[PDB]
Amino acid sequence: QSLLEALNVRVVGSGEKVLVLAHGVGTDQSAWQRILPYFVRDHRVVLYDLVCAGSVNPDYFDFRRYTSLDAFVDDLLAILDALRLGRCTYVGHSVSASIGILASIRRPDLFAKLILIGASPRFLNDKNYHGGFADGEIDTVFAAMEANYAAWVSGFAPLAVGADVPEAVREFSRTLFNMRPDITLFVSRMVFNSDLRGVLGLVTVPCSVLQTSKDHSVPESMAAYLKENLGGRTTVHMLDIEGHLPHLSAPNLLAQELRRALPR
Ligand SMILES: [Mg+2]
Numbered sequence: 205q206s207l208l209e210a211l212n213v214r215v216v217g218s219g220e221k222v223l224v225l226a227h228g229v230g231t232d233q234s235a236w237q238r239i240l241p242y243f244v245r246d247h248r249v250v251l252y253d254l255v256c257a258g259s260v261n262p263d264y265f266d267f268r269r270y271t272s273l274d275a276f277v278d279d280l281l282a283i284l285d286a287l288r289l290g291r292c293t294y295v296g297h298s299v300s301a302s303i304g305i306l307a308s309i310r311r312p313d314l315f316a317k318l319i320l321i322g323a324s325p326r327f328l329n330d331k332n333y334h335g336g337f338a339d340g341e342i343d344t345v346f347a348a349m350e351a352n353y354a355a356w357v358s359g360f361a362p363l364a365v366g367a368d369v370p371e372a373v374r375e376f377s378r379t380l381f382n383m384r385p386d387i388t389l390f391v392s393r394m395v396f397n398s399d400l401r402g403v404l405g406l407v408t409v410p411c412s413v414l415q416t417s418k419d420h421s422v423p424e425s426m427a428a429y430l431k432e433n434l435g436g437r438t439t440v441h442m443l444d445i446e447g448h449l450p451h452l453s454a455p456n457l458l459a460q461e462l463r464r465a466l467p468r
Contacts (some may be wrong), residue, residue, distance in 0.1 A: 207282050210264055213252045215287065217244035221466075226280070228298030229324065229391055230364070231379045231449070232257035235297070235300045238455035242463060250292070252283055254300070256391040258382025265387050273299070273398055275452045277306045284314055291316050293467055297451065298322040298421065305434075309406045317467040321458075322420045323430060325400035333401065334466055336423045342396055346389060347415045353385045366418055366447020367454070377451055394455040404433040411438045412465035415456075419448045441465065 207213075212233065217223075223243050225236040228232070233251040243249050253260050255270060269275050280303055284292070293316050295332050296304035301323035308315045327335045349358040357380045365372040380388065411434050415427035427440045445454040 205261075206286075207279070208286055209382045209447050210260065211255065211279060211283065212259055213250065213258075213283055213287065213430045215248055215250055215289075215360075216240065217242075217247045217249045219246035219248060221247045222250065222292035223247040223255040224284070224294045226252070226296045226300035227254065227257070228300055229256060229389070229395060230383070231297070231452075232259045233381070234259075235375065235449065235452055237378070239451050239459050239462065242459035246428060248289060250283075250287060250289065251328065252280075256383065256387050257386070258379055262387065265384070267390060268454065269389070271394065273302055273306055273395070273400075276303045276339060277310065280304075281314075282309055284311075290314070293317045293319065295319040295321065295462060296323070298324075298448070299391075299398075302395075302398060302400050303349070305400055305407060306403065308409050309403055312408050315409045318407075318409055318467070319414060319462060319465045320411060320430070321414045321450065322416045322419055322422055323413060324426055325430070325433075326398065327396050327421065330401075333429075334423060335438050336421065337396075337427075346393060349385065349389050349392070352383075353388075355448060357381060359462060363420055364466060365453050366449075367445075369453045372449060372452040376449060401433065405429065405435045407435040409436050410467065411436055413438060414441045414443055414450075414461055414465065416445075416446060416448060417443055418446050423449055429466070 232253045294304045301320035361377045413430045431438045450458040
């Protein structure tokens with residue numbers, strides 16, 4: 205396969221503006237399906253799957269290569285260079301918000317704006333920083349994942365969706381069960397260990413921070429931290445949608461905020 209084929213790159217929509225939708229761990233590009241109707245008549249929308257998606261051939265997940273977020277940034281930049289659509293708006297959920305931040309420091313030319321959903325530069329607390337997780341706290345999650353993947357997904361998918369939206373629990377269960385458990389564990393440990401705090405000030409592009417409500421992974425205080433520390437023009441939108449996956453659980457409401465955050 206080419207890189208574009210391996211990571212299931214898709215370009216949809218009729219417009220001149222370019223929008224990139226980049227999913228998080230545990231999902232794949234189909235997490236955007238109910239957002240697409242709101243953008244495809246005036247954007248060319250680029251979708252792709254992260255290499256850890258269960259929709260990507262598990263042969264591609266090379267543990268020697270994918271040891272830091274920078275190897276994920278390599279793949280994003282390689283796709284955007286291959287598609288040659290030029291300057292774009294980039295929407296990143298959870299790990300893809302971090303991937304977008306780092307890509308925008310390497311290649312600010314490529315990004316008109318970043319729209320960050322569920323963004324965190326560091327999950328672990330540090331001396332005078334609140335990520336949400338104390339030393340040792342995550343261990344019970346990675347123990348449960350390794351001990352009984354299916355029991356772990358059955359309890360975690362409702363928690364991540366947050367709101368009582370059976371269809372979202374279905375979709376997120378489907379994309380967690382499609383992942384190979386050793387990949388889910390490895391990538392979840394790598395992302396949980398990430399720390400982007402020291403590069404936020406190097407961002408130069410505008411950012412909209414769409415801050416999830418009652419997200420297990422990101423305290424509501426994070427939005428203020430990103431507004432203070434991101435180096436470009438940053439705006440905060442506190443979502444009135446519950447949970448980690450607002451694009452699955454309340455696509456209409458999330459799409460209306462995304463549209464409000466577009467550059468011009
Ligand atoms: Mg600045």
